[PDB]
Design a protein around this nucleic acid. Structure first.
Lengths: 46, 271
RNA sequence: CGCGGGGUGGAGCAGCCUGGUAGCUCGUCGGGCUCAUAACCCGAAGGUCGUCGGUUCAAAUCCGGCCCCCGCAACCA
RNA sequence: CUUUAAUGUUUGAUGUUCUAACGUUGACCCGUAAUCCGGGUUGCGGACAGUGUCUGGUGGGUAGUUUGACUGGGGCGGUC
RNA sequence: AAUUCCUUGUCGGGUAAGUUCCGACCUGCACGAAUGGCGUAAUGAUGGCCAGGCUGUCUCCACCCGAGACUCAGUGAAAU
RNA sequence: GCUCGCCGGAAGACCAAGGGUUCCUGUCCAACGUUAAUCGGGGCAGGGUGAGUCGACCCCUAAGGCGAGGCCGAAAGGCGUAGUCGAUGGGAAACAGGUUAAUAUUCCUGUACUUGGUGUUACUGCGAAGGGGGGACGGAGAAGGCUAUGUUGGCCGGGCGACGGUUGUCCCGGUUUAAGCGUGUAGGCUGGUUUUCCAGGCAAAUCCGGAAAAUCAAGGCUGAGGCGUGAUGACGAGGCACUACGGUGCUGAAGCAACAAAUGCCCUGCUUCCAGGAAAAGCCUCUAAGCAUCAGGUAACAUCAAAUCGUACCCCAAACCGACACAGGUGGUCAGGUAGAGAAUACCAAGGCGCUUGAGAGAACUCGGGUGAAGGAACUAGGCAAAAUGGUGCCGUAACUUCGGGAGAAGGCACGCUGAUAUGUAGGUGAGGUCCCUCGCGGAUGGAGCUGAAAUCAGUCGAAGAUACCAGCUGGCUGCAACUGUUUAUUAAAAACACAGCACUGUGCAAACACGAAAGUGGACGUAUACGGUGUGACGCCUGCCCGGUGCCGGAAGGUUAAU
RNA sequence: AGGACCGAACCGACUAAUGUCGAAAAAUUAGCGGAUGACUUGUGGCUGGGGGUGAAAGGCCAAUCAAACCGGGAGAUAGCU
RNA sequence: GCUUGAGUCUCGUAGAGGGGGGUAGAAUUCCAGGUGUAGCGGUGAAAUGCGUAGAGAUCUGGAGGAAUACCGGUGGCGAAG
């Protein structure tokens, strides 16, 4: 079968990146919530 | 010239190709081309507005000047080019001053003729001039609506506009549909009929003959499920609903024209 | 088994609904027109209102039992 | 009172024309190397068009919903 | 008949025997002309039927070759 | 270590992606591995990735995204211009050999190349966000010319051989060499050169385009490969020498010819058909606002810089994605010998592995298969399954048909090995010799050597000669659908959808329609031979009656009738 | 020339068998259809929940679809167990 | 060879001979405006149809398609149509 996860960091960072979230208001809510729970990994980035 | 091919395979047996031995088999003029990357019916919001469009072949757009603003200077037709975007052809025309431009290809026009743009033009098919200097009952095309737009009406294969009367500042036209409308008489119209008048007789043949052009399979509503199309559902092709569009509005009988801003200029209408 | 409707001169249909009088066309009989027929014209007759009972001043009519006839339904696991 | 006549007056319903609202996804110039936009001339329409409030009609395109019970299983017929 | 309830309708052909198939009869419960009608060469991992070749499908199984089953040593689940 | 067995267009050799040290050495065996384990992609410590030419970053853009103003919208925000990002695209430059336990076009040796800064000398007009050329281009087919590469001959080195012959037309191994520069071939394209004029290129222009004439017939541009140079170099079979017994040190002959020949290159070609096949910059060229004893530009030369990150290993898998060391999935490239049309298939090469449970037994039964007397669909829902047909050349081939088919119809025939025609032919390739010559990578003539079908006859052998793998079951009646194609990923692949074609109808451009509160896009940078919708569904012979009810179009006098 | 024919790579998925606590949450073996096109796939962006997409099945939208996933209304409500 | 067959050349004559492209007027239908009023149309008679939403009739202008009055004659022309 062809699995539902063919990883590609170029494509992965364009979507779920730090700046991609920081770009819009809806995304800015996410960084707020993530930091609200005290989650060490705020987003997917090295 | 129209030619009917021979059945060497299922699907080829119904093709008829309009072949032009006069059309230049080389390459079009360089400075008059630009990219015209497809859309597929999408808009700014990325949603499909118009159905059955997308895919197909890639075509380069030829920027053709419908204006005919280079006044008076005589021009010579160098070569006829095949235009993928229009049903008509395009002629590589060179003026006397040393300028190359594309224009539409009128009917009785061959390579090497002489044309001109302006009120000083003689009555010869291919010449573009204001409509108040043209005899009534003429046969023209590429007619404008504003002094400078470029030309809107009669811009496809084998279509010809008939001027009925020239009463005052307005000229009564009898369009291709049969609708008669008055327009500002100072709008330039190109004499004669447009060529490529065999385009109508072209029968595609294959399903791809329509596919590589740019269309998509038009799905009938009665095959769909009622949630999708206003028609649909049932067990064994059932119907009963009055024919409508996939958005509810009535089709097969309902005049949707309602502008009123241009209703004033319109005299008669298609019956 | 159940629901709705029907049965009327020889034939096909009204009138029933809202009860006291049964009409129309064709057919039948008689006469006339033509040499004769058809056709047409004139005149007259013919109906237990399917059957029985009940209610009633009055019943083809309203109700019910039965016979005949037609349409419809006779289902899902 | 009924039928009617001229004038004044009172608003209203058509028609034609005009320019100043407005439109202009017409041409040219500038801000500007920018086909978006604005501004300025001008040409074409023109008190329409279009928009806002109110109003009738159409309206499954869309939405929230109703669609009885008894019942010798439920439907059906019957009934309350 | 992708349509015929009664129906395996009736006749003829095909098998020794044919509720399917084929050609017809019209008595079409309830075909029908762009919710297309009647035909049609080629095409079809399509549906139904028959003939030939061919065979263990079957008549009726037998033997043989390998992987498990079985035994030994090691490890070591599951539904209930 | 010696045999055996498997893949070998892969189960091999390398890149991208993605992982994130899994790479190497020493050491250890609790836990991990479906068993043991002194073993390992496991634990522990240490070691390992070296760049001006590869990639990324950089310069330049597509789809598309963000988007100063601005337009729009309850707010958020939406759209979009100038701009600015965004490769899978374009653009400057390296090949060969050697080495480490592990990296190397990165390190060493040898030999070259590119783009800029700066300075001197000799000359000279340079100069933009502006203009032109260029970059720059489709599918398919065919032919010629080559190379990669293989076969073979010759040559050199070694051998002459544990059962029979084997100094012979004998056996084994090697017989490799780049980038760059020079030459500019086969071949491709285009007529060159000069003067003048010009409402064209938002300005200018000597550049480009156009119109006149003058002159000559070539010039110019491009271009694989070959040949020299690179290289009296390197490498190099195999010996001579030391073995911590892993390998190191040293030396080292031959190194050419011929034929066959690609899907690589020529080809970003040529021909042809049509559905008519990115953009921008680098690069080259011309001028403007101007600057001109300048500044800069062109050629040669001296010299300096070329920074930063990535680089180990896996990449058809015990390391990526599948919960697992999972019979699955994963883009691109190289891809030998024999038979063969072939990248199929059978066996082999370089190379890599025997799949992480094994030893016995030979019961029923089950799975994967072999063979099968007599019969041959009697099986069964049904010829499901198996069986069988299966290649090339030639002969032959019906009803019907849209005149292409049908058809590879059906049905048959000939194939092996040796000799001969011919100490291997037709044919292909093609040196030496000769002559000519606008003299070279040239042209005719010449034909050895090399290579090599098919055909006919004759002879021989077995049961069988397309001997294996590989490799059609055929025909007839008939329903549906024209046909290719698409579809329920994970029970339906069909008669369903689609389809070109037909018809009615909507739409005169700020088009109808659709998305969107709107602006603004799409429709279309199209305009009635055009666009949206519905219905039917190739082609052929046709397409009969009804406007009652419903829907819709046209006409509005009257009646009815809202806000006001 | 061909939505041409036979047939690998590639795509797809008709039959049978094994499998059904499988080697695997649709695969393996043996045969299959397409294989110059309406072909195929890589890289990369656009379209989004009554919306998207759709050669139309109510199939597809991260193993989930006649209205996805996550959180919040919410300890929804229950004449039901 | 000849020339009376047949055929060519030099010059004129009559003709709806044939094909292509233009153009004119009458008449009919429809369309727009104005005048104007209950019939119009039709047949043996009648009726369908048209009409007070204003036809027919009459005037003005226009859009369109086909056929060519009188000339026209048992005239001409053509192989025939």
């Amino acid at each position: 079968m062809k699995r539902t996860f063919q990883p590609s960091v170029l494509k992965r960072n364009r979507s779920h990146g730090f700046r991609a979230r920081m770009a819009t208001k809806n995304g800015r809510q996410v960084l707020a919530r993530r930091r609200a729970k005290g989650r060490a990994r705020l987003t997917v980035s090295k | 010239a129209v030619v009917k091919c021979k059945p060497t395979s299922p699907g080829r047996r119904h093709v008829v190709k309009v072949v032009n031995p006069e059309l230049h088999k080389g390459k079009p003029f360089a400075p008059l081309l630009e990219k015209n990357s497809k859309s597929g019916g999408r808009n700014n919001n990325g949603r499909i507005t118009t159905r059955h469009i997308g895919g197909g072949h890639k075509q380069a757009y030829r920027i053709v000047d419908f204006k005919r603003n280079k006044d008076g200077i005589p021009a010579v037709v160098e070569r006829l080019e095949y235009d993928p975007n229009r049903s008509a052809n395009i002629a590589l025309v060179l003026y006397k001053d040393g300028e190359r431009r594309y224009i539409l290809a009128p009917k009785g026009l061959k390579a090497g003729d002489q044309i001109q743009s302006g009120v000083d033009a003689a009555i010869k098919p291919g010449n573009t001039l204001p409509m108040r200097n043209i005899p009534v009952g003429s046969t023209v095309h590429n007619v404008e609506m504003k002094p400078g737009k470029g030309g809107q009406l009669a811009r496809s294969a084998g279509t010809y506009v008939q001027i009925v009367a020239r009463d005052g500042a307005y000229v009564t036209l009898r369009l291709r549909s049969g609708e008669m409308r008055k327009v500002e008489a100072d709008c330039r119209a190109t004499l004669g009929e447009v060529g490529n008048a065999e385009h109508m007789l072209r029968v595609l043949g294959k399903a791809g003959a329509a596919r590589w052009r740019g269309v998509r399979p038009t799905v009938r509503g009665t095959a769909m499920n009622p949630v999708d199309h206003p028609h649909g559902g049932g067990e064994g092709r059932n119907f009963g609903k009055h024919p409508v569009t996939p958005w509810g509005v009535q089709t097969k009988g309902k005049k949707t024209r309602s502008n009123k801003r241009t209703d004033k200029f319109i005299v008669r209408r298609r019956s």
